[PDB]
Amino acid sequence: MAKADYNKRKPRKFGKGARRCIRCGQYGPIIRIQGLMLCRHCFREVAPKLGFRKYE
Amino acid sequence: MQKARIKIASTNVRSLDEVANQIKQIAERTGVRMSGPIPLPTKRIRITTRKSPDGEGSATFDRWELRVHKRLIDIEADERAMRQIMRIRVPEDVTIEIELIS
Amino acid sequence: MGQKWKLYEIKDGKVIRKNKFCPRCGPGVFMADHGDRWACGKCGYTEWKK
Amino acid sequence: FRYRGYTLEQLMNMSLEELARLFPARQRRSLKRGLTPEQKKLLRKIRLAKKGKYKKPIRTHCRDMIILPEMVGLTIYVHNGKEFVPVEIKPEMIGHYLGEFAPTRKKVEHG
Amino acid sequence: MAIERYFIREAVREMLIDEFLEKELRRAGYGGLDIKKTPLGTKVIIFAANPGYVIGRGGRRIRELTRILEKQFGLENPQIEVEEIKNPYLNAKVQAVRLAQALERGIHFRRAAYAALRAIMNNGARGVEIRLSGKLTGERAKSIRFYQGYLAKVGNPAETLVSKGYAQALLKLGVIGVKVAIMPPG
Amino acid sequence: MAKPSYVKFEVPKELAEKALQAVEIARDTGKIRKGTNETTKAVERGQAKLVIIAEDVDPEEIVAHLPPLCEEKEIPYIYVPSKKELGAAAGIEVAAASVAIIEPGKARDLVEEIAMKVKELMK
RNA sequence: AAUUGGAUUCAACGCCGGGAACCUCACCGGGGGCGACGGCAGGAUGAAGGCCAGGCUGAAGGUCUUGCCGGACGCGCCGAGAGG
């Protein structure tokens, strides 16, 4: 038949479902918001190139 | 003349000190009176994180350091005597801020 | 698609337009004349008969 | 005081503002801030039923509406999640939620 | 925002461009990206064993790389430069990507291991390791460990001194993980 | 327009190609009409110079009145033997069972030659 | 009605969950709906997209009755995609 567009159109103003990462594309899995939105799992793989240091 | 503040921070130790030292050496001799390169704090940033992606058994937990250090420099020179001193190469990776007041 | 849509009437050496032309916007936009309720054509507007 | 409020009729004529001083903190808020674009199509179907154009049996997913004095009388069909469970609305139902009266679980014994 | 966040913003900027360019420039032979960041036009320095692939097959790839750089960033005039890596055999991440292609190709395990070991030891490697975790063409989870000379020590002045290159060499029956850990003289 | 049964004058295979190509420059420089319901208005007011009409329109509603009316307006008509052969010709790569060139633009040396040669023979 | 799933002795049970009112969300109930690229037959004799108004929908021209515009190309299957 005929119908108008959809790409989702519901409220998602805030919460976890609001967020997605810039590496594994998730809502519920982790989003470290410091201007580095990724999951905890990516974070570990990425950091030595970031310049974070393992040492306590 | 115009009292300028060079506020210079860097993410690593070796990169910040070489620029601070070089800035106090080249400026020393010309039409500049310069107050010494003062170290302010390290706003050490702690990210404290869960290693294991299972979150299972014992999970060993990474401590993260991001240390950002800030040297500050007052200087009495022109806006032209300022660019002459801002010629320098500068590590990647070194933020140099300039406020200008009389 | 949906044929047939030849709703413009024919004179002998002229044409005439069956449907109504809108009075909210200017000419160039025809009315789905329901008899009391006018739809719009360019975009889709709830208009009542004047 | 039998019948909740001053009298069933005088709270249909006080609607906007004057009801508020009587109501809970929670019912006030949702009237005062307003309700969603599905709550605007439910103000046509209570109005088709009291008078005029052929009345629909009013159905709703509204479980966040708090019962007003004008809506007392209609038989309201509140979707429990599977099916529509009826509620004949009374004047003792002024000041309670609409999602209270219809169920949120099937009602049986535990064991 | 502040001092703290911006540095992390920049470093996040490094990853999004280093992740894509690796995966593309496996034909070239990817080894790094020296990223010079300015308000005029972001100047990325792509590191390849070979510059003749990165340019492309007639200008296409260098323009393609100029064109996807405008989409990610807000510097719409990003330059491209190709610097050679001076020893690609001293670089492990090159040897990982180079080994991955050869296992993609189907050449046998210990053979595809021997050559690799031999080309980088000739180059000047105090010591070298290749590990290959994977199916190993059956259905048991066993790695094969190819070993010569010194290796990564203890602590962290371990991992800084050595090189380390990782690459998923795809197959059509499964997968094989390609780890190559090089120890340069130092 | 026309049918596959109306053959009143000849349309050579050399004069129908020049009229597929003097209608293609007509859309990419000037103005063109296309879709038969908008064309059934452009020959009749007097906005068309040379009509060109494809031979496959049926049902008849805009096909019984337009062979005797177009000889009374002083306008010549010319045949394409298909809707997909007048469509590609129209300017575009999609059908057009009728067209009305309002304004020759860069087709002007070719649309005065084909409109006297068809009017000479029979409109 | 569904109480999403996985985890299970140490080493599953403040575990994946570093954030479940909608969102999340994968479950249930109800209303509504996209299928690339090729082949095949169809085309502009006007939309594939939009839309009053009732009649229907918990709402959405969504659906029917009903009447119509802006400018111009897409079903049904058959290999075979994107998505999960």
Coordinates of all heavy atoms in Angstrom, one line a residue, chain F residues 31-102:
Chain F
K31 N 11.1 25.2 -22.5 CA 10.1 24.6 -21.7 C 9.5 23.4 -22.5 O 9.5 23.4 -23.7 CB 9.0 25.6 -21.5 CG 9.4 26.8 -20.7 CD 9.9 26.4 -19.3 CE 9.9 27.6 -18.4 NZ 9.9 27.0 -17.0
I32 N 9.0 22.4 -21.8 CA 8.3 21.3 -22.5 C 7.1 21.0 -21.7 O 7.1 21.1 -20.5 CB 9.2 20.1 -22.7 CG1 8.7 19.2 -23.9 CG2 9.3 19.2 -21.5 CD1 9.2 19.7 -25.3
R33 N 6.0 20.5 -22.4 CA 4.9 19.9 -21.7 C 5.0 18.3 -21.9 O 5.5 17.9 -23.0 CB 3.6 20.5 -22.2 CG 3.4 22.0 -22.1 CD 2.8 22.5 -20.8 NE 3.6 22.3 -19.6 CZ 4.3 23.2 -18.9 NH1 4.3 24.5 -19.2 NH2 4.9 22.8 -17.8
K34 N 4.5 17.5 -21.0 CA 4.4 16.1 -21.1 C 3.4 15.5 -20.1 O 3.2 16.0 -19.0 CB 5.8 15.4 -21.0 CG 6.7 15.9 -19.9 CD 8.0 15.2 -19.9 CE 8.8 15.6 -18.6 NZ 9.9 14.6 -18.4
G35 N 2.9 14.3 -20.4 CA 1.7 13.7 -19.8 C 0.5 14.2 -20.5 O 0.3 15.4 -20.6
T36 N -0.3 13.3 -21.1 CA -1.3 13.6 -22.1 C -2.5 14.6 -21.7 O -3.0 15.3 -22.5 CB -1.9 12.4 -22.8 OG1 -0.9 11.5 -23.3 CG2 -2.9 12.7 -23.9
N37 N -2.8 14.5 -20.4 CA -3.8 15.3 -19.8 C -3.4 16.8 -19.7 O -4.3 17.7 -19.8 CB -4.2 14.8 -18.4 CG -4.7 13.3 -18.5 OD1 -4.9 12.8 -19.6 ND2 -4.9 12.7 -17.3
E38 N -2.1 17.2 -19.6 CA -1.6 18.6 -19.7 C -1.4 19.0 -21.1 O -1.4 20.2 -21.4 CB -0.3 18.7 -18.9 CG 0.3 20.1 -18.7 CD -0.1 20.8 -17.4 OE1 0.4 20.5 -16.3 OE2 -0.9 21.8 -17.5
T39 N -1.1 18.0 -22.0 CA -0.9 18.3 -23.5 C -2.3 18.5 -24.2 O -2.4 19.5 -25.0 CB -0.2 17.2 -24.2 OG1 1.0 16.9 -23.5 CG2 0.1 17.6 -25.7
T40 N -3.3 17.7 -23.8 CA -4.7 18.0 -24.3 C -5.3 19.4 -24.1 O -6.2 19.8 -24.7 CB -5.7 16.9 -23.7 OG1 -5.2 15.6 -24.0 CG2 -7.1 17.0 -24.3
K41 N -4.7 20.1 -23.1 CA -4.8 21.6 -22.9 C -3.9 22.6 -23.8 O -4.3 23.7 -24.0 CB -4.7 22.0 -21.4 CG -5.6 21.2 -20.4 CD -5.2 21.5 -19.0 CE -6.0 20.7 -18.0 NZ -5.3 20.8 -16.6
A42 N -2.7 22.1 -24.2 CA -1.7 23.0 -24.9 C -1.8 23.2 -26.4 O -1.4 24.3 -27.0 CB -0.3 22.6 -24.5
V43 N -2.1 22.1 -27.2 CA -2.7 22.2 -28.5 C -4.0 23.0 -28.7 O -4.2 23.7 -29.8 CB -2.8 20.8 -29.2 CG1 -4.0 20.0 -28.5 CG2 -3.0 20.9 -30.7
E44 N -4.9 23.0 -27.7 CA -6.3 23.6 -27.7 C -6.4 25.2 -27.4 O -7.1 25.9 -28.1 CB -7.3 22.9 -26.8 CG -7.6 21.5 -27.4 CD -8.6 20.7 -26.5 OE1 -8.7 20.9 -25.3 OE2 -9.2 19.7 -27.1
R45 N -5.7 25.6 -26.4 CA -5.5 27.1 -26.1 C -4.8 27.8 -27.2 O -5.2 28.9 -27.6 CB -4.7 27.3 -24.8 CG -5.4 26.9 -23.5 CD -4.3 26.9 -22.4 NE -4.9 26.5 -21.1 CZ -4.2 26.1 -20.0 NH1 -2.9 26.0 -20.0 NH2 -4.8 25.7 -18.9
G46 N -3.8 27.1 -27.8 CA -2.8 27.7 -28.7 C -1.5 28.1 -28.1 O -1.0 29.2 -28.3
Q47 N -0.9 27.1 -27.3 CA 0.4 27.3 -26.7 C 1.4 26.3 -27.4 O 2.6 26.5 -27.3 CB 0.4 27.0 -25.2 CG -0.5 28.0 -24.4 CD -0.1 29.4 -24.4 OE1 -0.7 30.3 -24.9 NE2 1.1 29.6 -23.7
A48 N 0.9 25.3 -28.1 CA 1.8 24.4 -28.9 C 2.1 24.9 -30.4 O 1.1 25.3 -31.1 CB 1.1 23.0 -29.0
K49 N 3.3 24.8 -30.8 CA 3.8 25.2 -32.2 C 3.7 24.1 -33.2 O 3.1 24.2 -34.3 CB 5.3 25.6 -32.2 CG 5.7 26.7 -31.2 CD 5.2 28.1 -31.7 CE 5.5 29.1 -30.6 NZ 5.1 30.5 -31.0
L50 N 4.2 22.9 -32.9 CA 4.1 21.6 -33.6 C 3.7 20.6 -32.6 O 4.5 20.3 -31.7 CB 5.5 21.2 -34.1 CG 5.7 19.7 -34.5 CD1 4.8 19.4 -35.6 CD2 7.1 19.4 -34.8
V51 N 2.5 20.0 -32.7 CA 2.3 18.8 -31.8 C 3.0 17.6 -32.4 O 3.3 17.6 -33.6 CB 0.7 18.5 -31.5 CG1 0.3 19.2 -30.2 CG2 -0.2 18.9 -32.6
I52 N 3.4 16.7 -31.5 CA 3.9 15.4 -31.9 C 3.1 14.4 -31.0 O 3.0 14.5 -29.8 CB 5.5 15.3 -31.7 CG1 6.0 13.9 -32.0 CG2 5.9 15.6 -30.3 CD1 7.4 13.8 -32.3
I53 N 2.4 13.4 -31.6 CA 1.5 12.5 -30.9 C 1.8 11.0 -31.1 O 1.8 10.5 -32.3 CB 0.0 12.8 -31.3 CG1 -0.2 12.7 -32.9 CG2 -0.3 14.2 -30.8 CD1 -1.5 13.3 -33.3
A54 N 2.0 10.3 -30.0 CA 2.3 8.8 -30.1 C 1.1 8.0 -30.4 O 0.0 8.3 -29.9 CB 3.0 8.4 -28.7
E55 N 1.3 6.9 -31.1 CA 0.2 6.0 -31.7 C -0.2 4.8 -30.8 O 0.0 3.6 -31.3 CB 0.6 5.6 -33.1 CG 0.6 6.7 -34.1 CD 1.0 6.2 -35.5 OE1 2.2 5.8 -35.7 OE2 0.1 6.2 -36.4
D56 N -0.6 5.0 -29.6 CA -1.0 4.0 -28.6 C -2.1 4.4 -27.6 O -2.2 3.6 -26.6 CB 0.2 3.4 -28.0 CG 0.8 4.2 -26.9 OD1 0.8 5.5 -27.0 OD2 1.1 3.7 -25.8
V57 N -2.8 5.5 -27.8 CA -3.7 6.0 -26.8 C -5.2 5.4 -27.0 O -5.8 5.7 -28.0 CB -3.8 7.6 -26.8 CG1 -4.5 8.1 -25.5 CG2 -2.4 8.2 -26.8
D58 N -5.6 4.7 -25.9 CA -6.8 3.8 -26.0 C -6.9 3.1 -24.6 O -6.0 2.2 -24.3 CB -6.6 2.7 -27.0 CG -7.7 1.6 -27.0 OD1 -8.9 2.0 -27.1 OD2 -7.3 0.4 -27.0
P59 N -7.9 3.3 -23.7 CA -9.2 4.0 -24.0 C -9.1 5.4 -24.7 O -8.2 6.2 -24.5 CB -9.7 4.2 -22.6 CG -9.2 3.1 -21.8 CD -7.9 2.7 -22.4
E60 N -10.1 5.7 -25.6 CA -10.4 7.0 -26.1 C -11.1 7.9 -25.2 O -12.2 7.6 -24.7 CB -11.3 6.9 -27.3 CG -10.7 6.2 -28.5 CD -11.6 6.4 -29.7 OE1 -12.8 6.0 -29.6 OE2 -11.1 7.0 -30.7
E61 N -10.5 9.1 -24.9 CA -11.2 10.3 -24.2 C -10.6 11.6 -24.7 O -11.3 12.6 -24.8 CB -11.2 10.3 -22.7 CG -12.0 11.4 -22.0 CD -12.1 11.3 -20.5 OE1 -12.5 10.3 -19.9 OE2 -11.9 12.4 -19.8
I62 N -9.3 11.5 -25.0 CA -8.5 12.6 -25.6 C -8.0 12.1 -27.0 O -6.9 12.6 -27.5 CB -7.3 12.9 -24.6 CG1 -6.3 11.7 -24.4 CG2 -7.9 13.4 -23.3 CD1 -6.6 10.8 -23.3
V63 N -8.6 11.1 -27.6 CA -8.2 10.5 -28.9 C -9.3 10.6 -30.1 O -8.9 10.6 -31.2 CB -7.8 9.0 -28.7 CG1 -6.9 8.6 -29.9 CG2 -7.1 8.8 -27.4
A64 N -10.6 10.7 -29.7 CA -11.7 10.9 -30.8 C -11.8 12.4 -31.3 O -12.1 12.5 -32.5 CB -13.0 10.5 -30.2
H65 N -11.8 13.4 -30.5 CA -11.8 14.9 -30.8 C -10.5 15.6 -31.4 O -10.7 16.6 -32.1 CB -12.5 15.7 -29.7 CG -11.6 16.0 -28.5 ND1 -11.7 15.4 -27.3 CD2 -10.6 16.9 -28.3 CE1 -10.8 15.8 -26.4 NE2 -10.1 16.8 -27.0
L66 N -9.3 15.1 -31.3 CA -8.0 15.8 -31.6 C -7.4 15.7 -33.0 O -6.5 16.5 -33.3 CB -7.0 15.6 -30.5 CG -6.1 16.8 -30.0 CD1 -6.6 17.3 -28.6 CD2 -4.6 16.5 -29.9
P67 N -7.7 14.6 -33.7 CA -7.4 14.6 -35.2 C -8.2 15.6 -36.1 O -7.6 16.2 -37.0 CB -7.5 13.2 -35.7 CG -7.4 12.4 -34.4 CD -7.9 13.2 -33.3
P68 N -9.6 15.7 -35.9 CA -10.3 16.9 -36.6 C -10.2 18.3 -36.0 O -10.5 19.3 -36.7 CB -11.8 16.4 -36.6 CG -11.9 15.3 -35.6 CD -10.5 14.7 -35.5
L69 N -9.9 18.5 -34.7 CA -9.7 19.8 -34.1 C -8.4 20.5 -34.3 O -8.3 21.7 -34.5 CB -9.8 19.7 -32.5 CG -9.9 21.0 -31.7 CD1 -11.2 21.8 -31.9 CD2 -9.7 20.7 -30.2
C70 N -7.3 19.7 -34.4 CA -5.9 20.2 -34.7 C -5.7 20.7 -36.2 O -4.7 21.3 -36.5 CB -4.9 19.2 -34.3 SG -4.9 18.8 -32.5
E71 N -6.6 20.3 -37.1 CA -6.6 20.9 -38.5 C -7.3 22.2 -38.6 O -7.0 23.0 -39.5 CB -7.2 19.9 -39.5 CG -6.7 18.5 -39.5 CD -7.2 17.6 -40.6 OE1 -7.2 18.0 -41.8 OE2 -7.7 16.5 -40.3
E72 N -8.2 22.5 -37.6 CA -8.8 23.8 -37.4 C -8.0 24.9 -36.6 O -8.4 26.1 -36.8 CB -10.2 23.6 -36.7 CG -11.2 22.7 -37.5 CD -12.5 22.5 -36.7 OE1 -12.5 22.7 -35.5 OE2 -13.5 22.1 -37.4
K73 N -7.1 24.5 -35.8 CA -6.2 25.5 -35.1 C -5.0 26.0 -35.9 O -4.3 27.0 -35.4 CB -5.6 24.9 -33.8 CG -6.6 24.1 -32.9 CD -7.7 25.0 -32.2 CE -7.1 26.0 -31.2 NZ -8.1 26.7 -30.5
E74 N -4.7 25.4 -37.0 CA -3.5 25.7 -37.9 C -2.2 25.3 -37.2 O -1.3 26.1 -37.0 CB -3.5 27.2 -38.4 CG -4.8 27.7 -39.0 CD -5.0 27.3 -40.4 OE1 -5.1 26.0 -40.6 OE2 -5.2 28.1 -41.3
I75 N -2.2 24.0 -36.9 CA -1.0 23.3 -36.2 C -0.9 21.9 -36.9 O -1.9 21.2 -37.1 CB -1.2 23.2 -34.7 CG1 0.0 22.6 -34.0 CG2 -2.5 22.5 -34.3 CD1 0.0 22.7 -32.5
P76 N 0.4 21.6 -37.2 CA 0.6 20.2 -37.7 C 0.9 19.2 -36.6 O 1.5 19.6 -35.6 CB 1.8 20.4 -38.6 CG 2.6 21.5 -37.9 CD 1.6 22.4 -37.2
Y77 N 0.4 18.0 -36.8 CA 0.8 16.9 -35.9 C 1.6 15.8 -36.6 O 1.5 15.6 -37.8 CB -0.5 16.2 -35.2 CG -1.7 15.9 -36.1 CD1 -2.0 14.6 -36.6 CD2 -2.6 16.9 -36.5 CE1 -3.1 14.3 -37.4 CE2 -3.7 16.7 -37.3 CZ -3.9 15.4 -37.7 OH -5.0 15.1 -38.5
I78 N 2.5 15.1 -35.9 CA 3.4 14.1 -36.4 C 3.5 12.9 -35.5 O 3.3 13.0 -34.3 CB 4.8 14.8 -36.7 CG1 5.7 13.8 -37.5 CG2 5.4 15.3 -35.4 CD1 7.0 14.5 -37.9
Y79 N 3.7 11.7 -36.1 CA 3.5 10.4 -35.4 C 4.9 9.9 -34.9 O 5.9 9.9 -35.7 CB 2.9 9.3 -36.2 CG 1.4 9.6 -36.7 CD1 1.1 9.4 -38.0 CD2 0.5 10.1 -35.8 CE1 -0.2 9.6 -38.4 CE2 -0.8 10.3 -36.2 CZ -1.2 10.1 -37.5 OH -2.5 10.4 -37.9
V80 N 4.9 9.4 -33.6 CA 5.9 8.5 -33.1 C 5.2 7.1 -33.0 O 4.0 7.2 -32.5 CB 6.5 8.9 -31.8 CG1 7.8 8.1 -31.5 CG2 6.8 10.4 -31.7
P81 N 5.7 6.0 -33.4 CA 5.0 4.7 -33.3 C 4.9 4.1 -31.8 O 4.5 2.9 -31.7 CB 5.7 3.8 -34.3 CG 7.1 4.3 -34.3 CD 7.0 5.8 -34.1
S82 N 5.4 4.8 -30.8 CA 5.3 4.3 -29.4 C 5.4 5.4 -28.3 O 5.9 6.5 -28.6 CB 6.4 3.2 -29.2 OG 5.9 2.0 -28.6
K83 N 4.9 5.1 -27.1 CA 5.0 5.9 -25.9 C 6.5 5.9 -25.3 O 6.9 6.9 -24.8 CB 4.0 5.4 -24.8 CG 4.2 5.9 -23.4 CD 3.1 5.5 -22.5 CE 2.7 4.0 -22.6 NZ 1.9 3.5 -21.5
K84 N 7.1 4.7 -25.3 CA 8.5 4.6 -24.9 C 9.5 5.2 -25.9 O 10.7 5.4 -25.6 CB 8.9 3.1 -24.6 CG 8.6 2.6 -23.3 CD 7.1 2.1 -23.2 CE 6.6 2.1 -21.8 NZ 6.6 3.5 -21.3
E85 N 9.1 5.4 -27.2 CA 9.9 6.1 -28.2 C 9.7 7.6 -28.2 O 10.6 8.3 -28.6 CB 9.6 5.5 -29.7 CG 10.2 4.2 -30.0 CD 10.1 3.8 -31.4 OE1 10.3 4.6 -32.3 OE2 9.8 2.6 -31.7
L86 N 8.5 8.1 -27.9 CA 8.3 9.5 -27.5 C 8.7 9.9 -26.1 O 9.1 11.1 -25.9 CB 6.9 9.9 -27.8 CG 6.5 11.4 -27.7 CD1 7.4 12.4 -28.5 CD2 5.1 11.6 -28.1
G87 N 8.8 9.0 -25.1 CA 9.3 9.2 -23.8 C 10.8 9.6 -23.7 O 11.2 10.6 -23.1
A88 N 11.7 8.7 -24.2 CA 13.2 8.9 -24.4 C 13.5 10.2 -25.1 O 14.4 10.9 -24.8 CB 13.8 7.7 -25.1
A89 N 12.7 10.4 -26.2 CA 12.7 11.6 -27.0 C 12.3 12.9 -26.2 O 12.8 14.0 -26.4 CB 11.8 11.5 -28.2
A90 N 11.3 12.8 -25.3 CA 10.7 14.0 -24.5 C 11.8 14.9 -23.8 O 11.4 16.0 -23.5 CB 9.7 13.5 -23.5
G91 N 13.0 14.4 -23.6 CA 14.0 15.0 -22.8 C 14.5 13.9 -21.8 O 15.7 13.8 -21.6
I92 N 13.5 13.2 -21.1 CA 13.7 12.3 -20.0 C 13.9 10.9 -20.5 O 13.7 10.6 -21.7 CB 12.6 12.6 -18.9 CG1 13.0 12.1 -17.5 CG2 11.3 11.9 -19.3 CD1 12.5 13.0 -16.4
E93 N 14.2 9.9 -19.5 CA 14.3 8.5 -19.8 C 13.1 7.7 -19.2 O 13.2 6.5 -18.7 CB 15.6 7.9 -19.3 CG 15.9 8.0 -17.8 CD 17.2 7.3 -17.4 OE1 17.6 6.3 -17.9 OE2 17.9 7.9 -16.5
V94 N 11.9 8.3 -19.3 CA 10.6 7.7 -18.8 C 9.5 8.3 -19.7 O 9.6 9.4 -20.3 CB 10.5 8.2 -17.3 CG1 9.0 8.1 -16.8 CG2 11.4 7.3 -16.4
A95 N 8.5 7.4 -19.9 CA 7.4 7.6 -20.8 C 6.8 9.1 -21.0 O 7.0 9.9 -20.1 CB 6.2 6.7 -20.5
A96 N 6.2 9.3 -22.1 CA 5.4 10.5 -22.4 C 4.7 10.3 -23.7 O 5.1 10.7 -24.8 CB 6.4 11.7 -22.5
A97 N 3.5 9.7 -23.6 CA 2.6 9.4 -24.8 C 2.1 10.6 -25.5 O 1.4 10.4 -26.6 CB 1.4 8.5 -24.3
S98 N 2.3 11.8 -25.0 CA 2.1 13.1 -25.7 C 3.0 14.1 -25.0 O 3.4 14.0 -23.9 CB 0.6 13.5 -25.6 OG 0.3 14.5 -26.6
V99 N 3.3 15.1 -25.8 CA 4.2 16.2 -25.5 C 3.7 17.5 -26.2 O 3.0 17.4 -27.2 CB 5.7 15.9 -25.9 CG1 6.6 17.1 -25.9 CG2 6.3 14.8 -25.0
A100 N 3.9 18.6 -25.6 CA 3.7 19.9 -26.3 C 4.9 20.9 -26.0 O 5.0 21.4 -24.9 CB 2.4 20.6 -26.0
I101 N 5.8 21.0 -27.0 CA 6.8 22.0 -27.0 C 6.2 23.4 -27.0 O 5.7 23.9 -28.1 CB 7.9 21.8 -28.2 CG1 9.0 22.8 -28.1 CG2 7.3 21.9 -29.6 CD1 10.1 22.6 -29.1
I102 N 6.1 24.0 -25.8 CA 5.9 25.5 -25.7 C 7.3 26.1 -25.7 O 8.1 25.8 -24.9 CB 5.1 25.8 -24.4 CG1 3.8 25.1 -24.4 CG2 4.9 27.4 -24.3 CD1 3.0 25.3 -23.1

